[PDB]
Assembly symmetry: D2
Homo-oligomer: 158 residues x 4
Amino acid sequence: EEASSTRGNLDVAKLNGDWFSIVVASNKREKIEENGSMRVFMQHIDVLENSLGFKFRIKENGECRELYLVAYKTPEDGEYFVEYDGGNTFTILKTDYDRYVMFHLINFKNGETFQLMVLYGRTKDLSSDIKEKFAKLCEAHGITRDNIIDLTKTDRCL
Amino acid sequence: EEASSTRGNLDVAKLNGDWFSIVVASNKREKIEENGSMRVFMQHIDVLENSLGFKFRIKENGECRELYLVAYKTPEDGEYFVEYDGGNTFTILKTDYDRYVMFHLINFKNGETFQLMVLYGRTKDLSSDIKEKFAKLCEAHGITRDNIIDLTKTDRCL
Amino acid sequence: EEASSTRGNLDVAKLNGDWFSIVVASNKREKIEENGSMRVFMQHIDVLENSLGFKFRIKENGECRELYLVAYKTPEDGEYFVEYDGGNTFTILKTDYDRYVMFHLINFKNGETFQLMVLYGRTKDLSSDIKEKFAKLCEAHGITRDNIIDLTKTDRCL
Amino acid sequence: EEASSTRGNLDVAKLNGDWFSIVVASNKREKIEENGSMRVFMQHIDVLENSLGFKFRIKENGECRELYLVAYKTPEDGEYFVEYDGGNTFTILKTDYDRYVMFHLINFKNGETFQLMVLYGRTKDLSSDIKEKFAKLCEAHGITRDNIIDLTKTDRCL
């Protein structure tokens, strides 16, 4: 069930399909809050050649804009790169394939960096248990419980 | 004089300007040989926001094609990413700024990887001494002396 | 039912979804034949901000590669631009939304140009009637019946 | 001396080199004013394969950001496409090669369009005569003399 890009046992092919944004967490809270560039509402993940496509929505000034970004696989185990509001490096932290997927991302922009962690579910919402396990990993990565945001209660541009 | 992105003391701003391809080395020799995607003839390096632009030439079927690629700075010390014949991660190994610059690159494409090392000079050719130091670093990175190619003797699409 | 980007009455939002390559036609036959860059097997069309995303497959050396290109809307009525094997300008010739969509494309590369016309269906195959109407438009655009290829009979990388 | 992409007699190869922003004009004045996306300070133009590279500076929040965009040649005589703050279509209106170059651009974004005209000089400033000829063309394209801005008097991020 559980796999991981970092662990090196993942089967990225199975990540293909629709996903929804459930919980986002970042210590640089400004980014995941209203009008934050990282507060993205995922929709679908495409598995392409040496890369992943992400179709998602974002509320830019009270208007849900539809976007699509391609992330490329890099030579370092499990790392993907995507240019978005800086240079981003992310990995697939944990996944069971048909329920959830936890991504861990680091952002670089003008000398600064920040961590970002997201939980995606194949359903509009997920098990309270899944959300706890995720809440823990955030803490295990320096992100405080005050910076973990549950997007299921808000408008995910649906 | 000497700096390094990996060493973390480099001043990438000084890399701006014209550069020429002097010596390329890769154990995956097919890549640096005639018609190889990595046998590139550098021309100029632009220092942009959170990235580097590379204007270079390449002989695709007896025809020197003019290209330009942008490489983005990633969150990991000195690493840049550029999509070209796969996912590439490179670093600035050694530079004295006004003479040479040695880059070290790893390529990933369809499960496979390979190292690539290049020496650029601000002049059409460089000191026999500079070429030796480079020949050594190649060896220090597993690339044999049989896979080190001196492009100064060939047509660099000039 | 029928709309058109050129006619200026189209509702591109309804083009969202899965599409299949049914018939391709070009007088520069080499392009639509085996190993031709334009012989693409469409899969899905995404409607994004000021653009369209295209996820399709292509057989590059007996190997079906998965790709995704973004085409941008230009200031000239119904014209979209996409960089692929040159500079491409295309328009939505005719569509009924839930069955077919006929695109007309012009390609520019190294001083040369060529027309390309494609018929996409929401189903793996389409009505013999739809294929006739398309066969006619091709002729109305200088493409001879000898250069109209029905991809439904071949392997569309399925 | 004078050539033109639209006139179809231009030799784009000679446009290679350093250029400076002299005068910008747009009836959608907000764009060419302080903090306007179109108020760009050109630096260099690279002539690539089937395209043009533009390295320029822009003051985003009192901070001169260094950028580089690639514009692709389209199948319609003299037209180039570049994605920047929408879909842009531009042409080389008039050039004498070693002094000035006048570009004419149309922008499309979210249903709206607007014209933009720029005069670039190989020198930090140009002849009062060159600026007049340009002022006239702007008028010949519906742009009023009140929307023609001379950037030579301001900080061009130099």
